[PDB]
């Protein structure tokens, strides 16, 4: 059913957060994102994939305003409670990629699409769409940070990719180039296997600029726990201009 769908996914970052906390998250994942936004005088910022909070607690605790949205109600709850715990309000607007600006009347200085999360997405029509959504939202002068795994690297390898230390370990089951398994297994052995879509690199920044957006500066980002000579995910900075 679709609420077991959606209930596995729950379970998922529910066990993330029990067994990752966010200082330590935060310590080790450092400011890049929060310095990009401040050098460009950001104030405004929308989250269009909440999910649990880390990034919108963390953008709230470096003073932006923060509008933080999500498909899922459920992921809002959690999200704002997690605020609330760091001592925060979170605005929660429950929204969908094909129709952002349904009840979001505002605009902004930034979007944030992070947790790469843009890889949800099966449908090619449905990245066109959420990607203009998030185009339309944005003030002349706005950016959007949108990142993504590698998947360039794993479709040109087969082994597993450690984060928090080794409290999670990442293997990629399946790999073509219409889908990616990924097998999660946790320090408690708690196991997850998630699907997602394996964009290369040069084919999000062409969806990108062919809904608008006019230049997209793309950053390797190295997080996993043993690094390689290629880094594990991809930040791309688009400016709408």
């Known amino acids: ?48 994939a909440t999910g649990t909070g880390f990034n919108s607690v963390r953008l709230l605790q470096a003073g932006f305003d923060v509008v933080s949205a999500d498909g899922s109600a459920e992921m809002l709850v959690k999200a704002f409670d997690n605020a609330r715990d760091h001592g925060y309000l979170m605005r929660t607007v429950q929204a969908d990629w094909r129709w952002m600006n349904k ?93 997602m879509f394996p964009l290369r690199k040069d084919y999000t920044r062409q969806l990108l600029h062919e809904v608008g957006f006019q230049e997209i500066n793309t950053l390797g980002d190295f997080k996993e726990t043993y690094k390689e000579d290629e880094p594990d995910f991809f930040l791309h900075v688009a400016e709408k201009n």
């Not at 059913?1 to 209930?7: A, G, M, P, R, T």
């Not at 944030?112 to 185009?135: I, M, P, Q, W």
């Open 1 to 48: 059913s679709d609420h077991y769908e959606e209930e596995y996914v729950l379970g998922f970052v529910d066990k993330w957060d029990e067994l990752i906390d966010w200082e330590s998250r935060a310590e080790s994942e450092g400011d890049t994102i929060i310095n990009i936004l401040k050098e460009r005088g950001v104030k405004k910022v929308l989250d269009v």
């Open 103 to 195: 009840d979001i009347h505002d605009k902004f200085d930034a979007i944030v699409c992070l947790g790469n999360s843009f890889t949800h997405l099966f449908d090619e029509g449905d990245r066109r769409k959420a990607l203009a959504e998030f185009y339309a939202l944005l003030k002349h002068d706005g950016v959007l940070l949108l990142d993504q795994r590698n998947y360039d690297a794993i479709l040109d390898s087969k082994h597993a990719h450690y984060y928090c230390g080794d409290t999670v370990s990442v293997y990629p089951e399946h790999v073509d180039e219409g889908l990616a398994r990924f097998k999660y297994e946790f320090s408690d052995g708690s196991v997850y296997n998630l699907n």
